[PDB]
Structure 1
Amino acid sequence: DICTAKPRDIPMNPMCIYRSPKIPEATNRRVWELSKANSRFATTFYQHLADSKNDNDNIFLSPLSISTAFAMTKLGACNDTLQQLMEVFKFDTISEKTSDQIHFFFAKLNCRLYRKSSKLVSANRLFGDKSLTFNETYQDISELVYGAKLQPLDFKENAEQSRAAINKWVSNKTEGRITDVIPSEAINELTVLVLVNTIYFKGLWKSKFSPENTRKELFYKADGESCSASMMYQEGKFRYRRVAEGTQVLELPFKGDDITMVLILPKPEKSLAKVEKELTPEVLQEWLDELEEMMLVVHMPRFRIEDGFSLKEQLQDMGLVDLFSPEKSKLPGIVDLYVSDAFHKAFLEVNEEGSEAAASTAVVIAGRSLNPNRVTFKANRPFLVFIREVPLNTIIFMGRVANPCV
């Protein structure tokens, strides 16, 4: 029960440490600085990701999930492998106690969230070759702080036999929602260590849409053409705000209020690309603060964004080079050993009931008469998505709906 535990409880200290040359109610100040760091990595990682994709492509990922995974390697990392790891994931920007116990505080953070009607649900695990003897202590720390210890498999001789085993463990742990996490030809005979983290969300809208009001409507893609979308519609009070250069910021809370979705819709004349490059941990928080309740009309499309990519190339571009290099990798705490590949997979499906909800609810509203000048948030062009937890402001999922059609 890593949740209700304290650092000194189960002693877990990293073989190598790295030293670089206000707080919400009912919250542990350690978990807070860490969460704020995930954010500095979230926007930087999303920007690099966006800039390398076509504007008409959707995106979705869990920056939190990816951060926890690579925190599990920071544990046994050493030398340049550890520095790059710290600088790339913005870990070098926190205090020493939290830094050395970075893995523990992640388990704490994830506890707080994996506890807050709306259920999260993931499958994270490291796979290493059986031919290697794994440092038992690291194994014990992971087992307790990361759900399970590193699982050994025979890649050396059973590459495909093992690659099927991994794609099976995720399916069984995600009720069949995340499949084929690892695409064939990914794990071969020289595969020694593989990172895997998948996740999706189950939740209901605090304020539901009625399927009776959903209509087919044009959605204007970045290419200049338009396609047919299923546009949901509803009226009510929502934390909203028209910010800089006409960009609209809407917040649709999930049942419980602790977790919500934030949409960033730019004005017709401004490309989502310009918003993506102006995005910063600050600017975002700045918008969220200005959010003010209001009675508005909400036009939003039903959509499903599935994104299963290999963090490797992306992260190498970002500077995490050694962790992937056979000749430069330094992971003395896990055994040379290096990361052959890292696979992340998350998906989001939004509809009238909520996220991953398979039911229907009509909606009857009598005695209502709103102001004729009320505003209307109409997401009929590309928009950014954030699934976050309040009041920590932790970014759990982040993505883009560039095309909700078909």
Structure 2
Amino acid sequence: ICTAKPRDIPMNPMCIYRSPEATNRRVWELSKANSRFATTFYQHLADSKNDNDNIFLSPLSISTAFAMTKLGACNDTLQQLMEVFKFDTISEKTSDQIHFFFAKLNCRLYRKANKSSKLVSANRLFGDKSLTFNETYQDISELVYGAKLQPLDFKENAEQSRAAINKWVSNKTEGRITDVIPSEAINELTVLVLVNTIYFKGLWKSKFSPENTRKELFYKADGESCSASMMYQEGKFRYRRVAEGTQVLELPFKGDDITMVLILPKPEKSLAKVEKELTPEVLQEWLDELEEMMLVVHMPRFRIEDGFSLKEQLQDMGLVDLFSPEKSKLPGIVAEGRDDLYVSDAFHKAFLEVNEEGSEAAASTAVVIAGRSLNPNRVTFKANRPFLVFIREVPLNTIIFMGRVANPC
């Protein structure tokens, strides 16, 4: 329940970790944590992609999914989830309290009176049909994050539950996110699949007239060309031309609660060095340094889609135990304490759509317990002069989506 207080809800999983208003000051602290994850996760992910191909994700989506996972985690595994997703940065000595505020942060995001921009979230546990999931686990999940445990047959019809999960996410994100879990990563041994969903749709505060949109040619690094639909408009915007001639433009959505932030550097320089210096502090320097201004905005009318596995990068960031069969401690999920429970692979999938009327983003993260850990299916071409995008929620300090547009064709 959103309407709640510290002691009221006894949200106590199996293992506690001790890291060496009040609620509002902690809800903010968790937002700080989320973005340090976002930033660092972004950086690691960028190394595994080219400089010229698109990148799109919801770092908040990922954070949430792994927080759901956390509830059944223990020992080393628990500790590492706290560190990697910067949840040990918050105040509370106890690690079962992180979830309290996470739910509260999720209450201010997905429930308001200010219904200008639609920003919805769904969570769902998909456990094996025959198994026995812990009673307390079940109700912490369902209470704190709203994740009901839908029984599915992983044992017999593995590949129909794989497509049932895909279809559930699919329904929850308006048709935009469908292929969350790559076809064959859930086998007979798969026990559980934890899923998160975020869906956004804003309308520009000051939209672009369709009349002024003109096709121009875009030239990819390859040495090829492609048409691109450029939009246009003049108006009063929060803008700034920061150090090294980098431009930071903010296009707010009806309401000013959620705004998009563009970031493009001077043509002679790359994005790479701006990418490499990105932190949650730097980003805030830029935002606080923004003044209003009459300016001409030329932004493409485009769509990008990005889907990948988080294993690699997450292991690089510090998530070692959770993915390993022998050391992964998750004994708070099933009946006795099946120690087997280890994560095979985790998948993310995002969609960004920008046009004259507004923007539409959507994403899904899924942690899969005990299936197959396949190699990722990623077919992308690379084109030039990319720009960073960020869809943020102002008041709550959270980065809903974030990405790099490098090809509007």
TM-score of the superposed pair, with normalisation by structure 1: 0.88
> Cα gap change, 1:144/1:152 in structure 2, threshold over 3 Å: closer, same or farther?
same
Cα distance in 2 between the residues matched to 1:54 and 1:379: 10
Cα distance in 2 between the residues matched to 1:332 and 1:62: 28
Percent identity among equivalent residues?
100
Moved more, 393-402 or 314-323: 314-323
Question: For the Cα contact (< 8 Å) 2:123–2:195, is it kept in 1?
Answer: yes
Question: For the Cα contact (< 8 Å) 1:200–1:347, is it kept in 2?
Answer: no
Q: Gaps spanning 5+ residues in structure 2: where?
A: 335-339
Cα distance in 2 between the residues matched to 1:70 and 1:192: 16
SS at match of 1:157: coil
Per the TM alignment, residue 95 of structure 1 is displaced from its structure 2 partner at its CA by 0.8
Cα distance in 2 between the residues matched to 1:368 and 1:163: 12
Cα distance in 1 between the residues matched to 2:375 and 2:176: 42
Cα distance in 2 between the residues matched to 1:234 and 1:364: 45
Per the TM alignment, residue 26 of structure 1 is displaced from its structure 2 partner at its CA by 12
Moved more, 191-200 or 206-215: 191-200
Question: For the Cα contact (< 8 Å) 1:263–1:386, is it kept in 2?
Answer: yes
- 1:358-397 → structure 2 map (5 Å cutoff): 381-397=385-401
Per the TM alignment, residue 197 of structure 1 is displaced from its structure 2 partner at its CA by 2.6
> Cα gap change, 1:25/1:382 in structure 2, threshold over 3 Å: closer, same or farther?
farther
Count of residue correspondences: 401
> Cα gap change, 1:27/1:403 in structure 2, threshold over 3 Å: closer, same or farther?
farther
> Cα gap change, 1:394/1:181 in structure 2, threshold over 3 Å: closer, same or farther?
same
Per the TM alignment, residue 125 of structure 1 is displaced from its structure 2 partner at its CA by 2.3
Cα distance in 1 between the residues matched to 2:268 and 2:140: 51
Per the TM alignment, residue 303 of structure 1 is displaced from its structure 2 partner at its CA by 1.6
Question: For the Cα contact (< 8 Å) 1:248–1:377, is it kept in 2?
Answer: no
> Cα gap change, 1:177/1:370 in structure 2, threshold over 3 Å: closer, same or farther?
closer
Question: For the Cα contact (< 8 Å) 1:310–1:344, is it kept in 2?
Answer: yes
Cα distance in 2 between the residues matched to 1:306 and 1:121: 19
Moved more, 194-203 or 37-46: 194-203
SS at match of 2:385: coil
Moved more, 352-361 or 154-163: 352-361
Question: For the Cα contact (< 8 Å) 1:40–1:281, is it kept in 2?
Answer: yes
Question: For the Cα contact (< 8 Å) 2:195–2:366, is it kept in 1?
Answer: no
Any idea what the Cα deviations from partners look like across 1:8-53, whole Å, max 9, x if unmatched? 2221123211123xxx999811110000100110000000011110
SS at match of 2:231: strand
Is residue 2:145 matched to residue 1:128?
no
Any idea what the Cα deviations from partners look like across 1:370-406, whole Å, max 9, x if unmatched? 999999999993100101011332111110101111x
Moved more, 114-123 or 343-352: 114-123
Cα distance in 1 between the residues matched to 2:74 and 2:101: 20
Any idea what the Cα deviations from partners look like across 1:136-172, whole Å, max 9, x if unmatched? 1111111122122333322122211211211121122
Any idea what the Cα deviations from partners look like across 1:294-342, whole Å, max 9, x if unmatched? 1110010012121222222221222212112221111122122122232
> Cα gap change, 1:173/1:246 in structure 2, threshold over 3 Å: closer, same or farther?
same
Cα distance in 2 between the residues matched to 1:360 and 1:44: 19
Cα distance in 1 between the residues matched to 2:371 and 2:301: 28
SS at match of 1:359: strand
Over aligned residue pairs, what C-alpha RMSD do you find?
A: 10.4
- 1:1-400 → structure 2 map (5 Å cutoff): 2-20=1-19, 28-96=24-92, 99-115=95-111, 117-219=116-218, 221=220, 226-335=225-334, 336-356=340-360, 381-400=385-404
Cα distance in 1 between the residues matched to 2:370 and 2:84: 54
Cα distance in 1 between the residues matched to 2:79 and 2:162: 31
Cα distance in 2 between the residues matched to 1:73 and 1:47: 23
> Cα gap change, 1:106/1:54 in structure 2, threshold over 3 Å: closer, same or farther?
same
Question: For the Cα contact (< 8 Å) 1:193–1:341, is it kept in 2?
Answer: no
Cα distance in 1 between the residues matched to 2:275 and 2:371: 41
Please identify runs of 4+ aligned residues in structure 1 that moved more than 6 A. 24-27, 357-380
Question: For the Cα contact (< 8 Å) 2:352–2:362, is it kept in 1?
Answer: no
Question: For the Cα contact (< 8 Å) 1:195–1:341, is it kept in 2?
Answer: no
SS at match of 1:182: coil
> Cα gap change, 1:389/1:379 in structure 2, threshold over 3 Å: closer, same or farther?
farther
Moved more, 330-339 or 396-405: 330-339
Question: For the Cα contact (< 8 Å) 2:128–2:190, is it kept in 1?
Answer: yes
> Cα gap change, 1:349/1:374 in structure 2, threshold over 3 Å: closer, same or farther?
closer
TM-score of the superposed pair, with normalisation by structure 2: 0.87
